[PDB]
Amino acid sequence: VNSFSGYLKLTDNVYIKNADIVEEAKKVKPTVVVNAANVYLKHGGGVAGALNKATNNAMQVESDDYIATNGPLKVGGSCVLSGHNLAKHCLHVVGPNVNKGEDIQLLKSAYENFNQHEVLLAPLLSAGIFGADPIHSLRVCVDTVRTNVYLAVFDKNLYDKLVSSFL
Ligand SMILES: O=C1CC[C@@H](c2ccccc2)N1Nc1ncnc2[nH]c3cc(F)ccc3c12
Fold it and tell me: Which residue of 1, 99, 109, 150 is most buried, as measured by CB atoms within 10 A?
């Protein structure tokens, strides 16, 4: 048993809710919150900009030090950093950005990072400003992640479409 509340169960291990991931993280304080990161960990907009804003820019300060030491992530890759006031840890995962012409095939590799964590609160990778089809992202999530994932979908109309179209 865990404290995630109000989720619809899609499969044995995937759950979904219409929620703001920032507000969800603040309430639950999960062990792991996933950020929709880019390779530079520049948290300007989308989920990343919102998570970073909620940390009062501490996520960005930590991220800039990480990049200065280690260089950029790979598309499809991840790193574990602090969750600040939102979670114990933040798993920064880079899904492909279609608006940069990145290979959508890399979305499966991106979701594989979730399997290193038993339970996660996460957004749909490559959705939103990353330009992929969220229905496709949900399918890849369900077919790739084997650990317990709680998906927060900000947009109510999209949440309803994702549920109603789920196979
Ligand atoms: O609704 C959806 C489906 C796709 C996904 C997404 C992913 C990367 C970039 C943009 C959008 N996304 N966005 C969110 N998902 C969950 N909680 C969120 N809190 C936010 C607060 C904000 F200021 C802006 C957006 C979100 C948000």
Answer: 150
